[PDB]
Specification:
6 copies of one chain form a homohexamer. By secondary structure, chain A is α+β, with helices and mostly antiparallel strands. Chain A has 2 domains: 121 residues, 2-Layer Sandwich (D-amino Acid Aminotransferase, Chain A, domain 1), CATH 3.30.470.10; 156 residues, D-amino Acid Aminotransferase, Chain A, domain 2, CATH 3.20.10.10. Chain A contains 7 helices and 18 strands. In chain A, strands 9, 10, 11, 12, 13, 14, 15, 16 and 17 form a 9-stranded mixed sheet that branches. In chain A, strands 1, 2, 4, 5, 6, 7, 8 and 18 form an 8-stranded antiparallel sheet that branches. The complex binds pyridoxal-5'-phosphate (6 copies), chloride ion (18 copies) and sodium ion (18 copies). The PDB classes it as transferase. The entry lists the keywords transaminase, bcat, IV-fold type, PLP-dependent enzymes, branched-chain amino acid aminotransferases, transferase.
């Protein structure tokens, strides 16, 4: 049912002790920023591998800085709390860890910088799909993606998902599995919760970060693996909508989405299938990396030894 | 300390019974919409007057519809729950009532329409400033207001305040009391939490609703009282930034802000002071209306008889 | 099968004589502008009534002027050619008349002003739905409406329908009957082939012409009939997307669309149904006008006497 | 006078057999997409060389896919039909071949995907200017170029030329030979019918494809020849208006425009003349390629042997 | 040759005494704001009439406030200095008076608020064209008008004319007499130095002030005279480009431009000529007002008695 | 006090001879363009080094061409006049030289191309800060930077500083030392008078020129020295606002600003200080270059031998 423990404001406590009032933190949620961090269980080694833990903890500290939450936690403390909780929960399987930071005020509309900074971290069992061949049908939304002018997508804020839900609602009631966004200038931005890649003529193409997207750690991982293991050309550039309809392959990528193939966009089918050949190679490489079976990428992994069963 | 009771999912319960897990509803908060409703205590009558209760309950139902929360509550139930809670709390003074509606999912990123609709209402003591002459110094923010393209301001969503906090943070660290917004086209929109009025040459001027603002009930109340009691011309139109610097008077208005005078905007002083003469007349008229001493506007008030002490 | 005749370049000819080469006029079609004009057959009088013939002929002359087609035809000639063809075709039933003007060049990319101006007019049986209660489900498109910057919607050009087809394709493959457009600023513009009206709180609301819409003769007719026969308030203004979702009623209007009720927009249902009460009154008034049974609006009708069977 | 034959819907027929009704296909023209393909006659070899035939046929298939025309023709069929028609016409000189694809509906406003796909191909004598030194005076138009938001320039649609004609009309009545466009953001896009290059400080500069331009085969050819034969730096980037006024050289390029020098832009003269030195080298290289006298680029040519007179 | 006197920094001095260094005030000119005020000589009365002197002096004080020039001069002082200089110059004919205010700094880039405020006023003979029937041919520029985002057009700043000169240069080298501007959204704004009016179907139409135009005193005068003397409908609204091409009449208006008829716009001719009938009535009414022969508008005039020769 | 001489319209004259009327050139200032050129005095050599004199003179000639000032001066004449004036002034210390070109008309609003071109050059003692460690606190302005649509930033026009002063006024009254600008699309552009650099993860980042910035000679110098002397990666790209808040270092650069460290942006502190390590290396390299003690960059220097005291 529930995990054994969670971390809250510098301490690990039993789950059933973290009880709050219904009315606590609704205003704090407007400030809230989060990470999603993966743990992958290698039963042959008896070790959990936490993927790019310090990169996620540094992004959370940056998101907190841009919200203007007062300084209270460190990068090393968030990394250590993640290790400690995965160990103490004693769950030997794939997990998601979610730090969530929030600033709490004396008044509903006090400025963030006058608030108190708080954080919890919780870890729960996750289901990987990296050993499954599946694909989604996407649409481009009639809703526009937030930009730096109004709500910087660089900040991994809960509030940014209100714009996401406009698109994901539309996609589901219009017969699609997932939405892609255009930015205010009309250029391809990202999915509702992950970055998008395209494959055309043996090249990987992905929107550049100033297209108004979150600076994904999975996106970075995929560009590295595509260049260094497969020797592919990867272009980070402005991407137009109609060119994506002619993509040989396409996929979403994100800590939660892992590598998720796109079969079609607005009912234009990816010519080489889903997962396409290059997608399938990147999915297999990614999997072997995160489960600790690719020594070349060991510096991306934080092992937590727990015992081999 | 705490109110005696609150309302939750169709029931009134003692405050200390509304306990939840720390991890409950963070994802639901992305969906959340709310109202702020005023109760004004008339000790001479022993009655609380709840201001434009049905208008607030209908706006909440509209906000919920635009979020796409499944149907669960009615306008009449939200009006009745507000009356019941103000009575049962037995607090004989000015109050704020806040309904907050949220949709809760099986998964973090399930579409809103597959969720369950929930709501609470809580009522707490409020401090009116309608018998005080005070004023704020405003700036125009370097952050842009959300528009219909990305996050419709018509929806009174918690998430819309993330954009608000960009502006209110900037205002406070730059020596101002409050921020005003420009819309993406560069035209004057609203404050961070209330609508803005200007007075120039004996006329009231306010941004039209398609300038990208919340359709305020206080804004509506002020236009009615300005036209019907004072016989003023009121223009709802596109408003430019530099014209506001030459305003004779200016004020913010909102359920929480009541009528809040603006002394200056980007260090251009309102020529007729703050509160200016027309501002002061509207503030006095508003006060007499909401405290039940203006029979002409009785249809805006819901009395809750509680006993005269 | 085919009509008896058509009009071409100042002459009426038998249908089967208007034969051209497959390769003729493809480049001319880029220039082409058109009207759709209704004839309504009153069997009790033995008369066809052609609706607002001179207004349609003047709009065609304006469209031709803005294309910069050399002067060749007159308003009176287009009105007379329409009368003559409806008479000579000897078809005693409702019809559509379509003038189509085009400029033909010596070279593919010669400037319009160096071309020759040509025109045909043809008339075919039409099916009215004014005695039927039906409704469409609409979406807002993810494709943006053309504006004055790139392709003025005031010009009733064939080429403007390429932008229309982006929206109408999307609507049909996404489970809808019809698309509505947003303009580049994000404000409600028009349908793919007709103007849109909304009814809310007993008022009619329609986008103002500078929202980037064709200046519809049906739109003008509806505003006149709503004000003069029903005494309704009609606002021509900037209209936001989410406000339309809360419309009590909505309808499309156009020479071809007559008065077409909208039941829902992006799966938000019009609260008072489709056709709603005000829609149903305007549809009945419109019908009685165009079939010549409303003496008040006789100056909008051009009778063509043909014999009462 | 007329060519002997043309191709229509999978068949070659004598020209005078391709007769249609005046009223046929005006609505189909809104859907229509086309290619312009060059044949260059080498009298010393008795061979026509058709330039980048498969690239043009693949672009036509992509344009047809983005229109959503049902599948009916193949890339190989369009390549073969082009060869067959050039041979059967027995015209031993430079030619233009124009495929034109169109979708035909039961009703005026049926969705493209419910239509029937049709196509013709015709070939006519062309005049090359590759052995002539000439130049055009250009202006930047006051009309804006279509973008992906409203009418994707990637689609080689007849309708896109309505926006072209706004600019080319203005240029001719204002004393210029040709118009250049700015995109909605104000950046340099393309000519009315061809891409634009600039030369400054020995470098070639051209707008990147996401500046909102057609992905020209001549543009691709010029970048290849500039890099591979001349060893020039070529930048594909965002280009500003005023920087173009300081260009040492400039030229238009396109299947129809071949390589067309620009002497001046808004009455700012290209400092190194027109054709400038680098322009003149690219024009001479291009010519030798397309007439089959550059063995290095033979894979771009489809020979059609016809006999050496 | 030169006027006898000018006013400078609170004093009238002989012209030849106002000598400065070549290097003085170039940086101050970036700050500079001005008015153009008309004096009209009535030889029958021996009086100069200065038109709407206080309105011009109040606009100058507002422009100075928005620049943030320190307070140094008053509205009454600028009105009195104008009277005094017109009298002391002893020139009995039509004149232009130009106040020019500037802030002077210790350093090139010191902030305006740390500078010293200075002003001169000079008066010179002017030529009225109010007794002449003439007309200009206009174009719409390919250059965009400044908006509130970058350079508020409400401020009558010298620097705003750099944007004007982009348009007026283009107009003259392209064969036109004058340029009109579109705003960044593509809507009609103003001329390079005056506001624009259109006449269509017996109504006057002019861009609303938030279209991004200077709040002209001549514009205000024309709307008053059109409504009050002619009983015309005047619409201040958003105006589209192509609708202006169909105007029956059009004219520029401004203190310097008086009432200047427009014969054509982008080679679309105003149907009722130039000056058209309504234009000609407004020109005659304006003239009789400013020369002091319309008692109804006497409160707009400041007489300066000088002697009747 | 004053320099001995200045250059004016092809001649050197004693300072006190360059006297003009107060009313001369205010309209000419709208046209005016300028350069700021540095002279650095090396007392050990008895030589002034004028930095990138020909690059500055060529930019001035380009600015003059884009204004459309008639041809009157040459690049070589402006270079020679600068040398001559620095020599004749006999001032042995660091100097600023400012050429200022202006077009003078017969009438206030004559087109620039009908005017006369004039120019002066003056040289004055300057204070270098290259031997000082200092830093500025910056904000991003609520005012938008001019773009190519309205006032091309490529032109180094006095009028462009009116937009600058909106930002620099706001910065000073809001407690900051200096303002940075966002462009109309919301991307980082430049400072009020200089370009901006960022350092993050050992890389230099600066907005690309089409972000709407002046093509700075100091910017070019810094990119050259960073790549060639330090071996740093330098990215010229679109830059987002929030990424700049996370910069390790930042600095302004310009002929007047030399290399000016930024300690903070909107109260986000540059993590590695100000001047940071890479900033400090570039400042020291720049200094040694301009004072003639780096033989590698001698071709950037124009020596003027004056005698070693
Ligand atoms: C979190 C997130 C991503 C993916 O980031 P990773 O670091 O790869 O998990 C992409 N888009 C959005 C909107 C996100 O919130
Ligand atoms: C709630 C709110 C207002 C004021 O609305 P009332 O109905 O007058 O309380 C104004 N602006 C915003 C952004 C709001 O959230
Ligand atoms: C023709 C048309 C209409 C309707 O115009 P009527 O004069 O009412 O037929 C509306 N929208 C568009 C795009 C049209 O082409
Ligand atoms: C066809 C076309 C071009 C040139 O394309 P090529 O493949 O080089 O012929 C350029 N611009 C536009 C708008 C076009 O239609
Ligand atoms: C001064 C000016 C006008 C006209 O203003 P009046 O008060 O009528 O002289 C119009 N447009 C611009 C840009 C101006 O500078
Ligand atoms: C002059 C200037 C700069 C710096 O240019 P340098 O050639 O380095 O002096 C930067 N920004 C603006 C706006 C400028 O006017
Ligand atoms: Cl809270
Ligand atoms: Cl540990
Ligand atoms: Cl990499
Ligand atoms: Cl939840
Ligand atoms: Cl009750
Ligand atoms: Cl009212
Ligand atoms: Cl044709
Ligand atoms: Cl007749
Ligand atoms: Cl009406
Ligand atoms: Cl057809
Ligand atoms: Cl063959
Ligand atoms: Cl290449
Ligand atoms: Cl100065
Ligand atoms: Cl006096
Ligand atoms: Cl009036
Ligand atoms: Cl001058
Ligand atoms: Cl010398
Ligand atoms: Cl370099
Ligand atoms: Na701890
Ligand atoms: Na498809
Ligand atoms: Na490791
Ligand atoms: Na209940
Ligand atoms: Na002030
Ligand atoms: Na009541
Ligand atoms: Na005829
Ligand atoms: Na619904
Ligand atoms: Na009639
Ligand atoms: Na065949
Ligand atoms: Na020139
Ligand atoms: Na070949
Ligand atoms: Na005085
Ligand atoms: Na004309
Ligand atoms: Na008077
Ligand atoms: Na000289
Ligand atoms: Na800080
Ligand atoms: Na040198």
């Amino acid at each position: 049912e529930n995990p054994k423990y969670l971390w809250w404001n510098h301490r690990i406590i039993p789950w059933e002790e973290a009880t709050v009032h219904l009315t606590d933190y609704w205003w704090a949620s407007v400030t809230a920023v989060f990470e999603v961090i993966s743990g992958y269980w290698n039963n042959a080694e008896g070790e959990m591998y936490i993927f790019r833990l310090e990169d996620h903890a540094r992004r959370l500290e940056q998101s907190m800085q841009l919200i203007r939450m007062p300084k209270e936690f460190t990068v090393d403390e968030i990394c250590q709390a993640t290790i400690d909780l995965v160990r103490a929960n004693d769950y030997r399987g794939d997990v998601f860890i979610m730090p969530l930071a929030y600033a709490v005020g004396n008044k509903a509309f006090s400025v963030v910088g006058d608030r108190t900074t708080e954080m919890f971290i919780y870890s729960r069992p996750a289901v990987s799909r990296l050993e499954e061949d599946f694909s989604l049908h996407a649409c481009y939304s009639s809703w526009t993606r937030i930009n730096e002018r109004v709500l910087p997508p660089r900040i991994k804020a809960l509030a940014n998902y209100r714009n996401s839900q406009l698109a994901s609602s539309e996609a589901a009631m219009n017969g699609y599995d997932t939405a892609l966004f255009l930015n205010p200038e009309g250029k391809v931005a990202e999915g509702t919760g992950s970055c998008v890649f395209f494959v055309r003529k043996g090249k990987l193409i992905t929107p550049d970060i100033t297209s108004g997207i979150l600076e994904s750690i999975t996106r970075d991982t995929v560009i590295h693996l595509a260049r260094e293991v497969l020797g592919l050309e990867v272009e980070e550039r402005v991407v137009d909508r109609t060119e994506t309809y002619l993509a040989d392959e396409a996929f979403l990528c994100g800590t939660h989405a892992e590598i998720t193939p796109i079969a079609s966009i607005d009912r234009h089918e990816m010519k080489h299938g889903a997962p396409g050949p290059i997608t399938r190679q990147l999915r297999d490489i990614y999997r072997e990396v995160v489960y600790g079976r690719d020594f070349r990428y060991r510096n991306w992994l934080t092992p937590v030894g727990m015992g081999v069963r």
